[PDB]
mmCIF file with all atom_site columns, C-alpha atoms in Angstrom:
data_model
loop_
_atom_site.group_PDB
_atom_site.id
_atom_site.type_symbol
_atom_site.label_atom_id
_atom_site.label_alt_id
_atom_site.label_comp_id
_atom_site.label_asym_id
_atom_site.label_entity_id
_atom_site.label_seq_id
_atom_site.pdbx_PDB_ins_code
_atom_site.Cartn_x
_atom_site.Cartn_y
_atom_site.Cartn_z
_atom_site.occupancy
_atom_site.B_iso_or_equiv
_atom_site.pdbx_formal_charge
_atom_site.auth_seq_id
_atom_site.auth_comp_id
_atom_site.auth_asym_id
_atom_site.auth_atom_id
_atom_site.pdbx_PDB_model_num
ATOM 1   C CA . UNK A 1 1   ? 13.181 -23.316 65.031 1.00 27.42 ? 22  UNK A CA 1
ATOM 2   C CA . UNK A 1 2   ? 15.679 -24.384 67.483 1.00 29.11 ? 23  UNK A CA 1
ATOM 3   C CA . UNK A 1 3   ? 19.149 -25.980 65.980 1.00 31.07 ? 24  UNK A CA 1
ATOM 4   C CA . UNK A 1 4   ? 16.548 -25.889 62.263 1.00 33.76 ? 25  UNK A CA 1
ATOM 5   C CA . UNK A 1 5   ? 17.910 -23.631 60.189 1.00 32.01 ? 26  UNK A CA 1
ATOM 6   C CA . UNK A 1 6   ? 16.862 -22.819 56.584 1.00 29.74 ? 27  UNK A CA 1
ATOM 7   C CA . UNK A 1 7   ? 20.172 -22.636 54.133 1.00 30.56 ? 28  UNK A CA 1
ATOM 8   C CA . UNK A 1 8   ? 22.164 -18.963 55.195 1.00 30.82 ? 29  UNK A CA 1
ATOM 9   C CA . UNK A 1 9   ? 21.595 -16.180 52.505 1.00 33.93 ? 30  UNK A CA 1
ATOM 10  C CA . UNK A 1 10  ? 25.100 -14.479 51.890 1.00 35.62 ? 31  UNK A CA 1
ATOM 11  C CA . UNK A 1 11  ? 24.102 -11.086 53.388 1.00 36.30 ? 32  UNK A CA 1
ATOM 12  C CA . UNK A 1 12  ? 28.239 -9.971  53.204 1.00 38.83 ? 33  UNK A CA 1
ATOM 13  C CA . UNK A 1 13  ? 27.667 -7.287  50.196 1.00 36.89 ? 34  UNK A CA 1
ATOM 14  C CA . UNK A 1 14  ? 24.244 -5.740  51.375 1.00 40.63 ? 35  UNK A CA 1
ATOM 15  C CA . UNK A 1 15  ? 25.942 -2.881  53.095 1.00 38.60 ? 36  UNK A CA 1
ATOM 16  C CA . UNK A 1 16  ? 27.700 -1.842  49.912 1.00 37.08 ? 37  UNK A CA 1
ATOM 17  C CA . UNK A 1 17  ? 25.354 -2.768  47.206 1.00 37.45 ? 38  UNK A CA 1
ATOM 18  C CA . UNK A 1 18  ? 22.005 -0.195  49.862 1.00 38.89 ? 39  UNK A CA 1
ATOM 19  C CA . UNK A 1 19  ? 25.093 2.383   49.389 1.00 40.44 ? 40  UNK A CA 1
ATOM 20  C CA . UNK A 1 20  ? 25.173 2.412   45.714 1.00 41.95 ? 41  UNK A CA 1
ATOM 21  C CA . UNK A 1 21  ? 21.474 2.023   45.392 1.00 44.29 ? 42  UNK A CA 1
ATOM 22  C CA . UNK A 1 22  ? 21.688 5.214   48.156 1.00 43.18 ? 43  UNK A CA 1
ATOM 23  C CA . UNK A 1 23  ? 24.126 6.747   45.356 1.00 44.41 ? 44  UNK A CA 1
ATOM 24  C CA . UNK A 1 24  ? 21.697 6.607   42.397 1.00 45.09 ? 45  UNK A CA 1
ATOM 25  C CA . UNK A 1 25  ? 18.904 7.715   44.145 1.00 44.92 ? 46  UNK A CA 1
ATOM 26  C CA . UNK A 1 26  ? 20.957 10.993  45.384 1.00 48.67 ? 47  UNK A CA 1
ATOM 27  C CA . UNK A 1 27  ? 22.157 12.007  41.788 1.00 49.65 ? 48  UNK A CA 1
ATOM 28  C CA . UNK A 1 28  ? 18.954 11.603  40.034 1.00 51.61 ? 49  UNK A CA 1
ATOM 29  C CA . UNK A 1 29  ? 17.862 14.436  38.557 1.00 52.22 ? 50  UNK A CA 1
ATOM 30  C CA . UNK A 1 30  ? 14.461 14.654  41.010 1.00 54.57 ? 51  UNK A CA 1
ATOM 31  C CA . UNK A 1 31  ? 15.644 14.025  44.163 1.00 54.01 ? 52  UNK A CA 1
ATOM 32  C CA . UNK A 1 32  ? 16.272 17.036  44.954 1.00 55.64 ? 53  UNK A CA 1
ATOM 33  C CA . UNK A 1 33  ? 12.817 17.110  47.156 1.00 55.43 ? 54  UNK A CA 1
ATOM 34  C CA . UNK A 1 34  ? 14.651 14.317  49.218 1.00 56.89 ? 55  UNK A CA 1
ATOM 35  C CA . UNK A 1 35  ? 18.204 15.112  49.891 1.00 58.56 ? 56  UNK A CA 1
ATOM 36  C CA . UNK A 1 36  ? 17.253 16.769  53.177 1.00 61.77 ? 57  UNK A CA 1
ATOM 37  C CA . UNK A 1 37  ? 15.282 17.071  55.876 1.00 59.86 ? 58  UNK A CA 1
ATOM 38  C CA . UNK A 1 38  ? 12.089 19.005  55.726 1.00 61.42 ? 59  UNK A CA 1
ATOM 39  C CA . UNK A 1 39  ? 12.622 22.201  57.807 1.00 64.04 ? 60  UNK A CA 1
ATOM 40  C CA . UNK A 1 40  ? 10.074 21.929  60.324 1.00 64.64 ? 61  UNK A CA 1
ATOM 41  C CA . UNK A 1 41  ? 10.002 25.633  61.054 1.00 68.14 ? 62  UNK A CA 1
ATOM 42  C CA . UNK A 1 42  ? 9.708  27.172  57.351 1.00 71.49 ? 63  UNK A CA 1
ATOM 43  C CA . UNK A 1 43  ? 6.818  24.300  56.579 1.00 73.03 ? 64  UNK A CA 1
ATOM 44  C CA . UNK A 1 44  ? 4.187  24.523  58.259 1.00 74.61 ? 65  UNK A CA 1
ATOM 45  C CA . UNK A 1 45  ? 1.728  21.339  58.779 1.00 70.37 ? 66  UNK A CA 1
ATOM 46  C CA . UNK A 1 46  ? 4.905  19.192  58.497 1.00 69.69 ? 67  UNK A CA 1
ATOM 47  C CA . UNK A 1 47  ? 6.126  18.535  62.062 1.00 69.37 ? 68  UNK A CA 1
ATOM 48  C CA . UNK A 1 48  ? 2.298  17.908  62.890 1.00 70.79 ? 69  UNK A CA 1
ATOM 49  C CA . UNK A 1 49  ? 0.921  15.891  60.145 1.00 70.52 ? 70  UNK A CA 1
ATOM 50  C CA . UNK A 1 50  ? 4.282  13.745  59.371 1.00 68.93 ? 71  UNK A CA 1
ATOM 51  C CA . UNK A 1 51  ? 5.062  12.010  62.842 1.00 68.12 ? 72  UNK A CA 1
ATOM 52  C CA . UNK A 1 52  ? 8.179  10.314  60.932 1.00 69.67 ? 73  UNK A CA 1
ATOM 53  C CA . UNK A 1 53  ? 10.037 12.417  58.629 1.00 70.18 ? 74  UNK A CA 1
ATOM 54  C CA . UNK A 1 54  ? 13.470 10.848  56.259 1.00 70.55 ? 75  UNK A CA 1
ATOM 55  C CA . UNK A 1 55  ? 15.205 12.080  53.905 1.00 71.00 ? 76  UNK A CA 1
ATOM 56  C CA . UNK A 1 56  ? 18.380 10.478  51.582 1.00 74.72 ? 77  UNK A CA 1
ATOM 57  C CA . UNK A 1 57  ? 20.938 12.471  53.968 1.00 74.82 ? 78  UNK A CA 1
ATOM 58  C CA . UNK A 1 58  ? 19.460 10.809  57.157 1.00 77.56 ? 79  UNK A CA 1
ATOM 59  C CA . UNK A 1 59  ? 19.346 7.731   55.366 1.00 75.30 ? 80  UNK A CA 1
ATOM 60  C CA . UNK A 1 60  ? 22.793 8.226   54.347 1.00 73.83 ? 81  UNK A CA 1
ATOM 61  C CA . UNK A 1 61  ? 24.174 8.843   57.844 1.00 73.87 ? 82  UNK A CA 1
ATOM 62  C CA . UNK A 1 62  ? 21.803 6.021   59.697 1.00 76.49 ? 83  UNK A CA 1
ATOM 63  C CA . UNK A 1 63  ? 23.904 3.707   57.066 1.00 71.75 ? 84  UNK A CA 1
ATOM 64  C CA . UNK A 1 64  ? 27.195 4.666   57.381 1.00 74.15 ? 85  UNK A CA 1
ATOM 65  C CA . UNK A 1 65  ? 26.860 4.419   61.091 1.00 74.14 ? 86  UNK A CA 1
ATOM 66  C CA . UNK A 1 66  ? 25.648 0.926   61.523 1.00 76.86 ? 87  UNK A CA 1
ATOM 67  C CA . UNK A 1 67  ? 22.241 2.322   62.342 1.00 73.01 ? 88  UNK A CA 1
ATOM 68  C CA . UNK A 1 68  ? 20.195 -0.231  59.721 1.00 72.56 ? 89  UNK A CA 1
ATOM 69  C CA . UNK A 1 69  ? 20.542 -3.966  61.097 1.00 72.31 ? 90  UNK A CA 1
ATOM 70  C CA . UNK A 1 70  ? 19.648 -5.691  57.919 1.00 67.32 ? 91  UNK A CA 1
ATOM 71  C CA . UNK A 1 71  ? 18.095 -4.848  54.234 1.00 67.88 ? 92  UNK A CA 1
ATOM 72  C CA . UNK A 1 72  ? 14.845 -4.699  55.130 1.00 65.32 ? 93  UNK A CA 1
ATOM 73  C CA . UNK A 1 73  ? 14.960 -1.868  57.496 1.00 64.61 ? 94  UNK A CA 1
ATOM 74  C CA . UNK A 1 74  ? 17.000 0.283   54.957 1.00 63.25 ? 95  UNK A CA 1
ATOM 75  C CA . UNK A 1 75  ? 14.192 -0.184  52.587 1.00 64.12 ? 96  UNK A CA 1
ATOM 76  C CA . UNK A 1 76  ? 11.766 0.590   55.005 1.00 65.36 ? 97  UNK A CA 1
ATOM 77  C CA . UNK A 1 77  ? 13.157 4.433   55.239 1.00 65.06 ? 98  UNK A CA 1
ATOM 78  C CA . UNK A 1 78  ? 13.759 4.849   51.510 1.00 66.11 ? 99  UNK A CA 1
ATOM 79  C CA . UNK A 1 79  ? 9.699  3.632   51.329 1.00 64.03 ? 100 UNK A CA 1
ATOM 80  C CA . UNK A 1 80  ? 9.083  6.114   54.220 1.00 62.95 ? 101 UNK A CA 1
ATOM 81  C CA . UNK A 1 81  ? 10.531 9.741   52.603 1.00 64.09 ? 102 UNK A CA 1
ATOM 82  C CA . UNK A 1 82  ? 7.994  8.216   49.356 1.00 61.65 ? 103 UNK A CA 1
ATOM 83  C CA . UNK A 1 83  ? 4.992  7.242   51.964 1.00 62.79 ? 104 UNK A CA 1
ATOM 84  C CA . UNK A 1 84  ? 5.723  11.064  53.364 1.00 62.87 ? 105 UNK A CA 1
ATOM 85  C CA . UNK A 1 85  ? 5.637  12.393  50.152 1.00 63.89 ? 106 UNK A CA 1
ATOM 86  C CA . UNK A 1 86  ? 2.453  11.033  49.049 1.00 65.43 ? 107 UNK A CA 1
ATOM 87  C CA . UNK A 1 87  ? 0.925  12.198  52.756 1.00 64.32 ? 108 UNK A CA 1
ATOM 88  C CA . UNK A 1 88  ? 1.762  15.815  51.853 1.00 61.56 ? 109 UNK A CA 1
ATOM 89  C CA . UNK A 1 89  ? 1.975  16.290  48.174 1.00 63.99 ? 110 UNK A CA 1
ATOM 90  C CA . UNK A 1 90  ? -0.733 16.436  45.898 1.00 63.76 ? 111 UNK A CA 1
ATOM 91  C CA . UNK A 1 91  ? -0.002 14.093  42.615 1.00 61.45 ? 112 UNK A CA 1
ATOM 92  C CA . UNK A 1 92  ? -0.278 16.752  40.403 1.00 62.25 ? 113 UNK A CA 1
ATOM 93  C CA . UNK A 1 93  ? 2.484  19.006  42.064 1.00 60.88 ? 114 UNK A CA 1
ATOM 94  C CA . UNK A 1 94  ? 6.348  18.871  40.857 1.00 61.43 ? 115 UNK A CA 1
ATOM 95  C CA . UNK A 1 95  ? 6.931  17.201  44.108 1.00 62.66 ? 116 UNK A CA 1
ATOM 96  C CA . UNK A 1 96  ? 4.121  14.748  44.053 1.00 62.90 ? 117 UNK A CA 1
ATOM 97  C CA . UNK A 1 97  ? 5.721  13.774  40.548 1.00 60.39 ? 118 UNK A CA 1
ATOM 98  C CA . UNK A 1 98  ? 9.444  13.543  41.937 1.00 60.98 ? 119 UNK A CA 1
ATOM 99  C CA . UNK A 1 99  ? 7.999  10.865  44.948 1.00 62.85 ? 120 UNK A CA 1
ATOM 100 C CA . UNK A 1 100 ? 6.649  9.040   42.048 1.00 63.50 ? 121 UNK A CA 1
ATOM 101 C CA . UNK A 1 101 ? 9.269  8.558   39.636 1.00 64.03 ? 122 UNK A CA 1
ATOM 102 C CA . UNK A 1 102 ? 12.084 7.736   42.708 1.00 63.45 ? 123 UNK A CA 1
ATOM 103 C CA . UNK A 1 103 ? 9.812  5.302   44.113 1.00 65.31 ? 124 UNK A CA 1
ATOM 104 C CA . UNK A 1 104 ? 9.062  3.450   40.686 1.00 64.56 ? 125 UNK A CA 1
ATOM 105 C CA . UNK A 1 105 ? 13.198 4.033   40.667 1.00 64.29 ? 126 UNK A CA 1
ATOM 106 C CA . UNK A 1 106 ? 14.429 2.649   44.016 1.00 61.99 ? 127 UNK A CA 1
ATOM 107 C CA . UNK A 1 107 ? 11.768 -0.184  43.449 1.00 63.36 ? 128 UNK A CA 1
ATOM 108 C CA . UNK A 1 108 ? 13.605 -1.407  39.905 1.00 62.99 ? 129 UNK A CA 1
ATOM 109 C CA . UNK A 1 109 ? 16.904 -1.011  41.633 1.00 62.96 ? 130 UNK A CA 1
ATOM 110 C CA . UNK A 1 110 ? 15.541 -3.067  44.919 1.00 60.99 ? 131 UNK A CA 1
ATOM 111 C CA . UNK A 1 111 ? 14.215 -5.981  42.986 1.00 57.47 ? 132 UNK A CA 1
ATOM 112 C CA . UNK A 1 112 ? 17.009 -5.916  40.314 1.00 59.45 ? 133 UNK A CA 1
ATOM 113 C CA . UNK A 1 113 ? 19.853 -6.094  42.570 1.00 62.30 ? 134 UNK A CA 1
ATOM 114 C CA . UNK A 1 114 ? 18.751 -8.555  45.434 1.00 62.88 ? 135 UNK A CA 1
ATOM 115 C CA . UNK A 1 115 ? 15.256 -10.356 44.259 1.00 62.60 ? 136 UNK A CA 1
#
């Protein structure tokens, strides 16, 4: 509360350390659903049904740009292009697999490098 502050959290590296997480998500080997935006006129359903599409290049920009104010919101849109994924995809599709795998991925990373 006012002048009550729990002990300050050393947030200095979080910018780099989301970027290298960012990194290993965009070089493994199924992420290639991911690395850009859906294109809203060659799928149809998607524009409709998805009313917040991401991807790891929008993600990539949003960061780079001072677009994410702290850790929590950059997770947030890696969950979303998974949580999109899932909406769309059945399980049992190459695609449905790929959302699975990064997720299960960026999760290990998530917890590994800051929890």
């Amino acid at each position: 509360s006012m002048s009550v502050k729990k002990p300050k959290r050393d947030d200095s590296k979080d910018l780099a350390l989301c970027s290298m997480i960012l990194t290993e998500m965009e070089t493994h080997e199924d992420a290639w659903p991911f690395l850009l935006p859906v294109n809203l006129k060659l799928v149809p359903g998607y524009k409709k049904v998805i009313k917040k599409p991401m991807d790891f290049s929008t993600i990539r920009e949003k960061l780079s740009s001072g677009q994410y104010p702290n850790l929590e919101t950059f997770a947030l849109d890696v969950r979303l292009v998974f949580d999109n994924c899932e909406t769309f995809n059945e399980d049992d599709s190459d695609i449905g697999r790929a959302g699975h795998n990064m997720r299960k991925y960026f999760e290990k990373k998530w917890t590994d490098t800051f929890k």
